[PDB]
Design a binder for this molecule. Structure first.
Ligand SMILES: NC(=O)c1cc([N+](=O)[O-])ccc1NCc1ccc(Cl)nc1
Length: 294
């Protein structure tokens, strides 16, 4: 590192390996992601560079985009833990409702900000949500999907998680909208509540059918235009919708109501982040401190 000092290898992101590193000069501790290939598309560097100006308290700060030696590195502010690890650590007792609500409220503020600036995430998941000791939670990797390209694999034959993908993406829609992020966040909200992934599909069709088995196979009534989607097949089985009370028990009606609006099939009916922030569920929102063991 011409200016760093790898503290250790965090993990293996969807784009490349991620390291915790310390800037030798400033002494700042950061997350360094080496991006995956043979020249680095100039189209990508310009788009990524624009994300440096996208700051909000609930968005992981992109500190630098380094294009040198024909390689691409992204330098991000560092946070000590992700929501996936936190949920596993809170598996026995569950994350307290006040903290679940605080986190959801903060993530929606983060999404409202990105979306108002025409920036989508497209691949939200527990591992991309970072938390600190102060009770803050932040979204990591916003806009990388568009700037770069389709995921599929990390960089070393690793299985892409489809659990949080919106149905319109699974049905082959080529144009993503802000709604895909709201869907993923609804899936995460449900998971924090029940302590089990809502739709743990192990293939694109299994993912789609797990959604259908729970929310009902969509039709033209609830989702105008669904039967004309690229990958829609008239042969899809027709499952009846399950009662929401059985999906995320023992969540209260305010919570179930908000979740139902975040999981509407029609992306156009799906609630926006701005509107979700005003939902009665957040009437008593607070900002608790989590018990974090680092
Ligand atoms: N910005 C970051 O700090 C960060 C970035 C990526 N990533 O993919 O670019 C992954 C995890 C991250 N932190 C959470 C974390 C998790 C585990 C450990 Cl040991 N230490 C920190």
């Amino acid at each position: 590192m011409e200016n760093f000092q790898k503290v250790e290898k965090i993990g293996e992101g969807t784009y490349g390996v991620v390291y915790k590193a310390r800037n030798k000069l400033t002494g700042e501790v950061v997350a360094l992601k080496k991006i995956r290939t043979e020249g680095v598309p100039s189209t990508a560097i310009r788009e990524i560079s624009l994300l440096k100006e996208l700051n909000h308290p609930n968005i992981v700060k992109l500190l630098d985009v380094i294009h040198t030696e024909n390689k691409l590195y992204l330098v991000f502010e560092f946070l000590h833990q992700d929501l996936k690890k936190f949920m596993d650590a809170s598996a026995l007792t569950g994350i307290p409702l006040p903290l679940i609500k605080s986190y959801l409220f903060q993530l929606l503020q983060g999404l409202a900000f990105c979306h108002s600036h025409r920036v989508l995430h497209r691949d939200l998941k527990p591992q991309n949500l970072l938390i600190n000791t102060e009770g803050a939670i932040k979204l990591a990797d916003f806009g990388l999907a568009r700037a770069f390209g389709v995921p599929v694999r990390t960089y070393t034959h690793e299985v892409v998680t489809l659990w949080y993908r919106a149905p319109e993406i699974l049905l082959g829609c080529k144009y993503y909208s802000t709604a895909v992020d709201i869907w993923s966040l609804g899936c995460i909200f449900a998971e924090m509540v029940t302590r089990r992934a809502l739709f743990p599909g192990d293939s694109e069709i299994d993912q789609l059918f797990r959604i259908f088995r729970t929310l009902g196979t969509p039709d033209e009534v609830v989702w105008p235009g669904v039967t004309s989607m690229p990958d829609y097949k008239p042969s899809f089985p027709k499952w009846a919708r399950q009662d929401f009370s059985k999906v995320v028990p023992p969540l209260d009606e305010d919570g179930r109501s908000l979740l139902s609006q975040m999981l509407h099939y029609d992306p156009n009916k799906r609630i926006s982040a701005k509107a979700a922030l005003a939902h009665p569920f957040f009437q008593d929102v607070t900002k608790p401190v989590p018990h974090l063991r680092l």
